[PDB]
């Protein structure tokens, strides 16, 4: 799979809006992930204790984590597919240290799409969402291949 420049444009156009407030989008996305797929929260030893959305929103550390997560993703998206260098450290830590299965990357991809659909309807119409889904599917495909190379693929 490979995206067209036109599709990359749709992806980077909405991401530019996301960047107006990375911290806020990071919070919304992680909170959506944890509420839609509670099992995912268990992978965060530093935040596994959070019981409610209120506690999640009030967590300064969770906010920092969200910023780090979206900034890393933004760098990857901006490479428009030429993200081999960026995927190496990310794949290693998530496969070997955090033990994050591909299914969970699909879950966070779903959360990203949900939040963008909610916050940016004008710039996240059907075609734009399709482009973003295509970009995230490419990300997960390449990450999965790396996982396999690293001996995890899960
Ligand atoms: C869009 C996909 C994701 C990106 C770009 C991403 C990015 C990052 C980055 C940059 C870090 C810090 C450096 C590192 O350890 O590699 C990190 C840490 C971490 N990630 Fe992810 N991540 C993603 C998805 C996930 C998912 C789905 C989970 C689990 C449900 C997860 C769990 C973790 C954990 C447990 C840490 C450690 C947090 C801490 O205690 O400091 N990540 N991630």
Curated annotation (Swiss-Prot):
Positions of the Globin domain: 2-148
Chain positions with Phosphothreonine modification: 68
Keyword Transport: yes
UniProt keyword Heme present: yes
EC category: oxidoreductase
Single Gene Ontology BP annotation: removal of superoxide radicals
Location(s) in or outside the cell: Cytoplasm, Sarcoplasm
Residue numbers binding nitrite: 65
Binding site for heme b: 94
Keywords on record: Cytoplasm, Heme, Iron, Metal-binding, Muscle protein, Oxidoreductase, Oxygen transport, Phosphoprotein, Transport
GO terms, molecular function: heme binding; metal ion binding; nitrite reductase activity; oxygen binding; oxygen carrier activity; peroxidase activity
Similarity section: Belongs to the globin family.
Stated role: Monomeric heme protein which primary function is to store oxygen and facilitate its diffusion within muscle tissues. Reversibly binds oxygen through a pentacoordinated heme iron and enables its timely and efficient release as needed during periods of heightened demand. Depending on the oxidative conditions of tissues and cells, and in addition to its ability to bind oxygen, it also has a nitrite reductase activity whereby it regulates the production of bioactive nitric oxide.
Identification of the protein by name: Myoglobin
Source organism: Physeter macrocephalus
